[PDB]
Design a binder for this molecule. Sequence first.
Ligand SMILES: Nc1ncnc2c1ncn2[C@@H]1O[C@H](COP(=O)(O)OP(=O)(O)O)[C@@H](O)[C@H]1O
Ligand SMILES: [Mg+2]
Lengths: 52, 76, 77
Amino acid sequence: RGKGAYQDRDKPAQIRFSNISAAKAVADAIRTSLGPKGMDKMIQDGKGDVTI
Amino acid sequence: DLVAKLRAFHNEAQVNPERKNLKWIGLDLSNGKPRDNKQAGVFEPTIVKVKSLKFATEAAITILRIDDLIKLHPES
Amino acid sequence: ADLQDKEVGDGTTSVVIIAAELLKNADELVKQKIHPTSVISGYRLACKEAVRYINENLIVNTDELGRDCLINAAKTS
Ligand SMILES: Nc1ncnc2c1ncn2[C@@H]1O[C@H](COP(=O)(O)OP(=O)(O)O)[C@@H](O)[C@H]1O
Ligand SMILES: [Mg+2]
C-alpha cells in the first residue's frame, strides 16, 4: 500500500479554508446581537441612509 | 449651592407632610435664590414636561441600544 | 427637537438637553459593566413613575386661577 494519492493541487484546500474563514467571520460579527441580552447595530449605507 | 438649596427644599417638602406647599419652590434667576414659583407666576403646561420626558427617554433608549456601527464607503 | 416642536411647540431645548444627559449617564453606567438592557428598563420605569408623580402631585388646575394663569404662562413663554 504505502502512500496514497499525492494530491498535488493545493488550491482546493485554500479555497475551502477561505470560505470557512469568511463564514466564521460573518458569524462572529453577528454573534453579539443574539438573545434577550443582545444589542442592535447601526448600519450607514453609501447613500448615507441609517438603519438600526 | 442653588441646586443644593432647591433639592433641600424639595426633600423637606417630600418628607414633611406639613410642608407640602414647598413643592412649588423653583429658581429665581434675577436674584439667584429659591422662590415659590406658583405665586411668582412661572407656569408651564404639564404636557410640555410629560412629552419632553417621554421623548427624551425614548431617544436615549434608541441611542443606547447601539453597540456596533458599520459605515459603508460611498460607491463614488 | 423637531418632533417636540411639532407635537407640543415648547420646551425644544429642554428635551434635547435632558436626552443628552440621560444618554451620557446611561453610558457611564454601561462603562461600569452594567448591561444596557438593565439601564433601559430602569429608564423606562423611572419615566413612567416620573409621569405618574407629576400627574398626581405637581399639577395646578387652571380653573383655580383664571385668566391670570394664561397670562403668567404666556409671559413665562
Ligand atoms: N421667569 C422665570 N423664572 C425662572 N425660570 C423661568 C422663567 N421663565 C422660564 N423659566 C424656565 O426656563 C426654562 C427654559 O425655557 P426656554 O428654554 O425658554 O424654553 P424652550 O426650551 O422651549 O426654549 C424653562 O424650563 C422654564 O421653567
Ligand atoms: Mg420655551
